[PDB]
């Protein structure tokens, strides 16, 4: 995930991403955007819900 | 709104050869997802391929997959389907499949606003 997304995600309240079949590593990059209300995470390939 | 019409079936022996095909008319371009459906005789419709528009990803079904293979024309607007060595599991009725932007579904009939006339697929 971009550095850019977690910084801006302060004030964003709904994020979506799609990856159509590539495997997304948060690395703990979200709890930043404490903000947001809505996450949605379709085909990004967890295979485990993030912490 | 959206029109999709078939052809390439019929009549096949297992070890045969088939090309199936289908070309669409209408709004060609707010297609997003593009896949096979047939249905077996009674059975339920089953997702037998699944390609996206123009990030190009291909998915097919397990029970087709190293037989089946999805085709797309884009400059006549035309999905085909080419598949060699068939068997006999693969006689139904096969329907040409659309969806729109915002759904994700590879094989699955729930969200796909577009069908074909249906093509008859025999294989002995």
């Known amino acids: 995930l971009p550095q850019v997304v977690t910084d801006v995600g302060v004030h964003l309240q709904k994020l979506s991403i799609n990856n159509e079949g590539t495997k997304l590593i948060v690395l703990n990059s979200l709890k930043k955007m404490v903000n947001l209300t809505e996450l949605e995470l379709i085909r990004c390939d967890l295979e485990r819900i993030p912490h | 709104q959206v029109q999709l019409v078939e052809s390439g079936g019929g009549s096949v022996q297992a070890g045969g050869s088939l090309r199936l095909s289908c070309a669409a008319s209408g709004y060609i371009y707010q297609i997003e997802y593009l896949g096979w459906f047939r249905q077996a005789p009674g059975k339920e419709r089953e997702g037998v391929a699944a390609?996206?528009?123009?990030?190009?990803?291909?998915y097919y079904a397990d029970s087709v997959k190293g037989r089946f293979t999805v085709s797309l024309d884009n400059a006549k607007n035309t999905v085909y389907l080419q598949m060699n060595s068939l068997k006999p599991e693969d006689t139904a009725l096969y329907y040409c499949?659309?969806?729109?932007?915002?759904?994700?579904?590879?094989?699955?009939?729930?969200?796909?606003?577009?069908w074909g006339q249906g093509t008859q697929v025999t294989v002995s």
């Open positions: 499949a659309a969806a729109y932007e915002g759904d994700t579904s590879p094989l699955y009939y729930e969200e796909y606003g577009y």
């Open positions: 390609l996206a528009t123009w990030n190009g990803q291909t």
